[PDB]
Structure formats: structure tokens, C-alpha cells
């Protein structure tokens, strides 16, 4: 399975790194959707973007580059491309899935959950989880607000594959 990474900023100052195992070996398109997006090989991709919508004690969500503000986004497919399954499941805090606008809209925006959040289960698919940083996830966290509005900026300042 791809690793990949985020490194975060908030304000401009470094948070850390967060380290991703995508499970391609169960969810193949959808993690190399995102992998593809990590790199920025087809020229557009995560870098640079913000996490822009932040609940403590819900999730951590990104991947808007083209609206930075949770309307937007661009899949490596041409267009919003289906769930590919929901065998994985949001079984606790750390896992990595795709955030939707309703059933077969995945793009690029996605979220790392930070508790179990099970009322998601067959509306959004899981396709990885944090392996490295979760204590980088929870100072992005610690920056969210109940309207989800964040308290500094907090930017993915370099991402790409480990392996």
C-alpha cells in the first residue's frame, strides 16, 4: 500500500508531518485518486490548500484547491467518480476517508476522522488511516470551532509519497 504525507502549517509555522497508508489493496481507485493528488503529478493537487472546515470532536476535513471552502475540488477521474465500496469502515480516530455531496460525488476533498464517527459507514468511503502525526492531526483539531470555521490557517504546505 502507497504512504504518503502532509506537512502542515498553521499561521506559517510548522505543525508536523502526517503519515497516510492509502488501502489500495482494498479501495484501489479511490486511494490513487488521492495519491495522484499528494504528488501533483497531473499538475494540480493538494499542495498549498488549506484544511478548511474543522470540528473537535468530529474531524479534520481538506482538499478544496479550487474553492478553499468546501464547495470545490477536482478528481484525477474527469469528473466525480462513484464509491467505490464501503468496506472500510470510520472506526475510530485517525481514519482517513472521503468527504461527498451525496452518493457518487467523491472529488478530491477528504477528511481524517478524530473519534469514531459510525453514522458515516456506507455514505463515505474510508480508504486509508493516519500511521504517523496523529498528534499533528490534533493540534489541526485544536484550531477548529463548532461552525467548523478555523482560528489560524492552516495550510498543507508540502505533501507527496513516501513509498
Keep these: 500500500n502507497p504512504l504518503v504525507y502532509l506537512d502542515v502549517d498553521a499561521n506559517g509555522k510548522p505543525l508536523g508531518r502526517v503519515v497516510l497508508e492509502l488501502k489500495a489493496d482494498v479501495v484501489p481507485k479511490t486511494a490513487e485518486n488521492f495519491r495522484a493528488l499528494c504528488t501533483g503529478e497531473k499538475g494540480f493537487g493538494y499542495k498549498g490548500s488549506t484544511f478548511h472546515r474543522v470540528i473537535p470532536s468530529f474531524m479534520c476535513q481538506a482538499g478544496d484547491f479550487t474553492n478553499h471552502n468546501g464547495t470545490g475540488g477536482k478528481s484525477i477521474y474527469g469528473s466525480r467518480f462513484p464509491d467505490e465500496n464501503f468496506?472500510?469502515?470510520?472506526?475510530?480516530?485517525?481514519?482517513?476517508?472521503?468527504?461527498?455531496?451525496?452518493?457518487?460525488?467523491?472529488?478530491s476533498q477528504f477528511?481524517?476522522?478524530?473519534?469514531?464517527?459510525?453514522?458515516?459507514?456506507?455514505?463515505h468511503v474510508v480508504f486509508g488511516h493516519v500511521i504517523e502525526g496523529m498528534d499533528v492531526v490534533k493540534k489541526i483539531e485544536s484550531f477548529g470551532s463548532k461552525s467548523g470555521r478555523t482560528s489560524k490557517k492552516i495550510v498543507i504546505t508540502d505533501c507527496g509519497q513516501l513509498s
Excluded at 111 to 123: A, E, M, Q, R
Design 87 to 107: 468496506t472500510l469502515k470510520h472506526v475510530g480516530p485517525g481514519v482517513l476517508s472521503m468527504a461527498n455531496a451525496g452518493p457518487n460525488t467523491n472529488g
Design 111 to 123: 477528511f481524517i476522522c478524530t473519534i469514531k464517527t459510525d453514522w458515516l459507514d456506507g455514505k
